[PDB]
Amino acid sequence: ERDRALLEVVRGNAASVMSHGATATLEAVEPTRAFRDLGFDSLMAVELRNRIGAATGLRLAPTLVFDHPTPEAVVRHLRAEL
Amino acid sequence: DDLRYKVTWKPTAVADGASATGTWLVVVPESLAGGGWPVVVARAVDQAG
Amino acid sequence: VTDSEKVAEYLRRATLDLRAARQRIRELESEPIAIIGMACRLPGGVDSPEGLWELVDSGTDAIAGFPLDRGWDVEGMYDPAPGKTYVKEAGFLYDAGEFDAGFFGISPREAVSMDPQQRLMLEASWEAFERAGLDPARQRGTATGVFVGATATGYVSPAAEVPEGAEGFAITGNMTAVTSGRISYTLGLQGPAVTIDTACSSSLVALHLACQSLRQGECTTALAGGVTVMPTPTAFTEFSRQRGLAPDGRCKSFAAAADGTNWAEGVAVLVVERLSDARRNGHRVLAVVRGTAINQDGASNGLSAPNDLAQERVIRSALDNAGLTASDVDAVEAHGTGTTLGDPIEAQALLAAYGHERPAHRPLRVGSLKSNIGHAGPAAGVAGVIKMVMAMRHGVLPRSLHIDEPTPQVDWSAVTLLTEPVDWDRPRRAGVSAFGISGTNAHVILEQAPTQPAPPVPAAPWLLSAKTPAALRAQARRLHTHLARHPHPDPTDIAHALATTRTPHEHRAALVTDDHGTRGPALAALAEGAPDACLISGTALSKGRTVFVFPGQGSQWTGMGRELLHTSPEFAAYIAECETALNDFVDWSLTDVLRGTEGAPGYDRVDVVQPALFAVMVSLARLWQHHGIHPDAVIGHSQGEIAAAHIAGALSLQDAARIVALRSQALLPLAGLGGMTSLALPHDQALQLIQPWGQDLSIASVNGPHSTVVSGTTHALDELHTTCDTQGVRARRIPVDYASHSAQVESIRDTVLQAATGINPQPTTIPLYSTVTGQPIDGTQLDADYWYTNLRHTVRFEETTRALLGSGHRHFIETTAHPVLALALEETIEATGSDARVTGTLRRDHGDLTQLHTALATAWTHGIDVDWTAVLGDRRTPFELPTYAFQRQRYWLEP
Ligand SMILES: *P(=O)(O)OCC(C)(C)[C@@H](O)C(=O)NCCC(=O)NCCS
């Protein structure tokens, strides 16, 4: 159950960062699509880093969006050191 | 002025549209007979599928 | 040899090299460039170049009121003085805020922060590539240039403390250089990405630079384009202080009623390359840019003023660059701004340059696209060239609007305006001018493209794909509408164009039928999403290794491979090779058995069916490989493993034929002693169910988690069948008179060892998975004892399939004449919760090319790469398919 919750948190944070404001793009973050294929840059990469670290209370590297390009890879990485 | 309104006509882009499906029932006044709009729109739905 | 004949050969070599070098010079300076594609979005509902042509030919005036969704205070900013404007209508792209962010990978955050110039330009470039017969996804890594004529119209307003929403992206999203850079970044192009700032001349200058870059070999292809959008109405307010805009907003080009110039938006792009490269690559040439020229005026009466001398000089330079006399061209797409100051100067320049020695019955026909859509701005010249291109294609010059009378400021008494449309010995040529306000005059000359079969493959699949299902439905509807307006297109050409010249996206669908009466309804049912018989749909997998599966018996039916023998020559050749291999170890020919020749044995006999199954399976697998589906693994089932052992390369054709033939011949005496029965239960349940019968019965094969075949003596088999009927278990007796994978085979054990004698096993080229051991097996280990164990020990198909799925394999292609193990494979796949997709090659009473192409299309829809060149052809006639159906969303910045 932990993996599903972590994937949900990552999807929510990625959708919030990906949107300028305010559902269509929430489902656009599937576990297989690479973050770079979603058009993520250094700025949104560090924003996801800060958001995920605040959610999990864990200091992550500043490139945790292309070292693990899929959201599922990010979930695996989070579950590793947690 | 917090309760003032009016109606306007916003221009919009010509939509791509779609194809006419099945049968469409066109009803016309007989006074017009075969003049302008009826024949032309009948043809338009004809080539629209 | 004499001295004369000796020096003659040296002279011949020297003059041949001289001709080669001179031709090199000619193609290195005066090379004709080919317009292989184009794409424009201009005001008036125009979305394609055909939209532009039907707009301009019909004489439609595409000027309407100001947009209301852009936040402008349109009711307040109109005043027919201090900071207002006296025009309430111009050419606008009301869908300029519409952009498919997801398709290009762009985020909504970046998209709204990004300039609509870039947003329009990306889609225009993608459509321009698609309309050229090129797959943009295949352009990645090529030395393709990008030359965009754009300008910083101002969408984020860097001088005004850029908004909080577009924070961080107001450099990347708004630098004019990034307008050209983003095309190459998204498409992966390698040629230079240069944006040009030249006001009302940037796009034609970009075309010039692209031509020079291609002539020097710096690029293979190039994108020459321009874009203009109006985030704010300042362009109307600043130009309203001076009476430069027309009072009503109509650009009365070269007319006596010329009183101003209304601005307009629009994007317009061309995909171009060298004419020789286009001919070599077999791209369709729309037109030929022969020459180009650019210069300045400098000594103009004011900075923002024209100069007839400079315009004449650039026109003459462009003519000389193309090596064409002035009388060669019979049309000009003049700038035609509509200004009182600009029009007489431009008309005088055109009259002095072009019309001075023309015949007395072929005046130069001058027109302007600005009369229809207004002044496009940066994208003016690259839209005018599109207009002239379609004028040459359709052989008719469209009329230029709002010319009540030719303007009296110039002495026309050589050159005439296009008041009404005019129709058209020598190739058609036409000039285009993009004179700018910064003094940078530009001019290009275009020429009509020079004048440029195979048998139709039956049941050619029609392939469609899109990023999302809604986009796929839109693609289907667009294709249906396009095909409706076409007089009897060739279906194989459409199949080739769809398969090769369009990207394979995620959500895919296919139409496989051999009659031109069902494709239309199938396209419709795809459009509204209803199902159809000849329609296939699926979601392609991003990654996954391919498997070939070779079941044992059961996948037989009379006439299998008969149609393929005539229709498919590759299958015929493979069957012939199998027959030649089999002839020495059997007393009949494979072709007679398959074709049902008189006197040949039927499939009832065990010794003839198994070699026939082996040959058919091997030929089908080799046909799959010939079509480009190279397996990453192979798995078998009893005798099928022998066929797998051939495809893996461990066993030669002769050795596999020997093994299968002698094994079946040694299995002949077992006929009538026992048989098999397939019951749907777990392995443990079947095992404990066979306990009372003991050694009489045994687990023949564990096909799946709820499908097991038990073999044994006929009496015990009937007893177990009665017991299952009492217990209500769906037990089915297979049509076989021989109890393989049972103790009875021990009676023939030594003979089996004779069957495999003399073979020469080799290591596997493709990883082969043994169903006996349950994991990969070395190729050299396939010895006689292994084959005896295969005939004797229980098949463990379920375990090896689970292991193979554990190894990342995701596609299971059954190379049978009819699927027999697809049920068990799908049962295992859903049991283990994997996303693997199973497919088969042929089906019962279905073995023609239509079923083969159906299987291939199903495999492609599941995501397996297929070499459609082999299936369809190397090169068919080009076909103009509709571009991608983008699913756009509004993206605009609010204050
Ligand atoms: P992230 O890597 O996407 O962004 C971080 C960065 C702003 C440091 C990066 O975009 C960057 O500047 N990379 C180097 C670019 C460069 O060296 N020259 C371009 C002209 S300054």
C835 to chain A, any CB pair closer than 8 A? The answer is: no
Q: From the centroid of its chain, how far is CA C867? A: 13
Q: Please provide the DSSP assignment of C540-607 as one string.
A: --SS-EEEEEE--SS---TTTTHHHHHH-HHHHHHHHHHHHHHHTTSSS-HHHHHHT-TT---TTSHH
Write out the two tokens for C537.
Answer: 């749909």
Please answer whether residues A72 and A56 qualify as being in contact, where contact means their C-beta atoms are separated by less than 8 angstroms.
no
Q: Tell if the CB–CB gap between C110 and A41 is shorter than 8 Å.
A: yes
Q: Tell if the CB–CB gap between A20 and C165 is shorter than 8 Å.
A: yes
Vertex C711 angle, CA C710 and C716, to 5°: 100
Closest by Cα among C217, C318, C281, C215 to C37:
C281
Please answer whether residues C289 and C446 qualify as being in contact, where contact means their C-beta atoms are separated by less than 8 angstroms.
yes
Distance in Å, alpha carbon of B34 to nearest chain C alpha carbon: 24
Give C441-503 as a 3 state SS string: EEEEEEEECCCCCCCCCCCCCEEEEECCHHHHHHHHHHHHHHHHCCCCCCHHHHHHHHHHCCC
Write out the two tokens for A27.
Answer: 């489902």
Class of domain C462-539: alpha beta
Does residue C700 sit in helix, strand or coil? strand
Please answer whether residues C246 and C340 qualify as being in contact, where contact means their C-beta atoms are separated by less than 8 angstroms.
no
Residues of C at the B interface, defined by Cβ within 8 angstroms: 44-45, 47, 64-65, 67-69, 92-95, 98, 477, 480-481, 484, 524, 527
Among partner residues A21, A24, A39, which is closest to C110 by beta-carbon distance?
A: A39
State the burial class of residue B49 (Cβ atoms within 10 Å of its Cβ: 0-12, 13-18, 19+).
middle
Cα separation, C649 vs C359, whole angstroms: 76
Distance C191 CA to ligand 1 centre (A): 20
Write out the two tokens for C588.
Answer: 């009949």
Closest by Cα among C801, C845, C848, C843 to C825:
C801
Q: Tell if the CB–CB gap between C109 and A18 is shorter than 8 Å.
A: yes
Q: Tell if the CB–CB gap between B18 and C477 is shorter than 8 Å.
A: yes
Q: Which experimental technique did the depositors report for determining this structure?
A: cryo-EM
Up-side HSE of residue C444: CA atoms within 13 Å toward CB? 35
Tokens 């020097």 sit on residue: C216
Cα separation, C693 vs C701, whole angstroms: 17
Cα separation, A40 vs C151, whole angstroms: 26
Cα separation, C263 vs C274, whole angstroms: 34
Please answer whether residues C283 and C308 qualify as being in contact, where contact means their C-beta atoms are separated by less than 8 angstroms.
no
Scan residues 9-28 of B and list those with Cβ closer than 8 Å to C: 10-14, 16, 18-19, 21
The H or E element spanning position C433 is: strand C429-433
Among partner residues C108, C112, C172, which is closest to A25 by beta-carbon distance?
A: C108
Vertex C113 angle, CA C111 and C118, to 5°: 60
Write out the two tokens for C889.
Answer: 């969303």
| Dihedral angle over CA of C709, C715, C718, C719, nearest 10 | -100
Neighbours of C548 (CB within 10 A): 27
In C, minimum Cα distance to A29 occurs at: C102
Contacts of C165 in chain A (CB under 8 A): 20-21
Please answer whether residues C812 and C837 qualify as being in contact, where contact means their C-beta atoms are separated by less than 8 angstroms.
yes
Cα separation, C807 vs C824, whole angstroms: 19
Neighbours of A45 (CB within 10 A): 19
Distance of CA A40 to CAs A47, C264, C367, C640, Å? 10, 34, 47, 49
Cα separation, C183 vs C208, whole angstroms: 19
Contacts of A30 in chain C (CB under 8 A): none
Chains B and C touch (3+ CB pairs under 8 A): yes
Cα separation, C414 vs C359, whole angstroms: 8
Scan residues 154-213 of C and list those with Cβ closer than 8 Å to A: 165, 168-169, 172
The protein residue with its alpha carbon nearest to ligand 1, atom 7, reads: A42
Distance in Å, alpha carbon of C69 to nearest chain A alpha carbon: 18
Cα separation, C38 vs C693, whole angstroms: 77
Cα separation, C662 vs C671, whole angstroms: 15
Q: From the centroid of its chain, how far is CA C693? A: 61
Distance A42 CA to ligand 1 centre (A): 9
In A, minimum Cα distance to C541 occurs at: A32
Give C829's DSSP letter: H
Q: Give the nearest ligand 1 atom to A41 CA.
A: 3
Chains B and A touch (3+ CB pairs under 8 A): no
Closest by Cα among C437, C430, C200 to C318:
C430
Give C362-415 as a 3 state SS string: CCEEEECCHHHHCECHHHCHHHHHHHHHHHHHHCEECCCCCCCCECCCCCCCCE
* φ, ψ dihedrals at B19, nearest 5°: -105, 140
Ligand 1 site residues (CB inside 6 A) read A 41-42
Distance C117 CA to ligand 1 centre (A): 23
Give C183's DSSP letter: H
Contacts of C884 in chain B (CB under 8 A): none
The protein residue with its alpha carbon nearest to ligand 1, atom 11, reads: A42
Biggest CA-to-CA distance, chain A = 32
- C58, C72, C94, C889, best to mutate vs chain B, most B CBs in 10 Å: C94
Among partner residues B13, B16, B49, which is closest to C484 by beta-carbon distance?
A: B49
Provide the angle, in degrees to the nearest 10, between the axes of the packed helices C381-394 and C202-215: 70
Q: Tell if the CB–CB gap between A28 and C102 is shorter than 8 Å.
A: yes
Contacts of A36 in chain C (CB under 8 A): 105
Distance C186 CA to ligand 1 centre (A): 17
**Final resolution, Å:** 3.1
Distance C189 CA to ligand 1 centre (A): 19
Pocket test for ligand 1, best of A42, A43, A48, A49 (most atoms within 8 A of CB): A42
- A20, A48, A65, best to mutate vs chain C, most C CBs in 10 Å: A20
Tokens 């050419």 sit on residue: C91
Q: Tell if the CB–CB gap between C109 and A17 is shorter than 8 Å.
A: yes
Q: Which chains reach chain A with 3 or more Cβ–Cβ distances below 8 angstroms?
A: C
Distance C178 CA to ligand 1 centre (A): 14
- Return the CATH number of the domain spanning residue range C22-448: 3.40.47.10
Among partner residues C106, C112, C889, which is closest to A39 by beta-carbon distance?
A: C106
* φ, ψ dihedrals at C798, nearest 5°: -65, -45
Contacts of B18 in chain C (CB under 8 A): 477
Q: Tell if the CB–CB gap between C105 and A38 is shorter than 8 Å.
A: yes
| Dihedral angle over CA of A72, A74, A75, A79, nearest 10 | 140
Q: Tell if the CB–CB gap between A43 and C105 is shorter than 8 Å.
A: no
CATH of C545-872, one of 3.90.550.10, 3.40.366.10, 3.40.50.2300, 3.40.190.10: 3.40.366.10
B5 to chain C, any CB pair closer than 8 A? The answer is: no
Write out the two tokens for C847.
Answer: 């073995």
> Is C200 labelled a binding residue?
yes
Closest by Cα among C608, C29, C68 to C321:
C29
Distance of CA C64 to CAs B10, B48, C664, Å? 11, 27, 83
Domain range annotation of chain C = 22-448, 462-539, 545-872
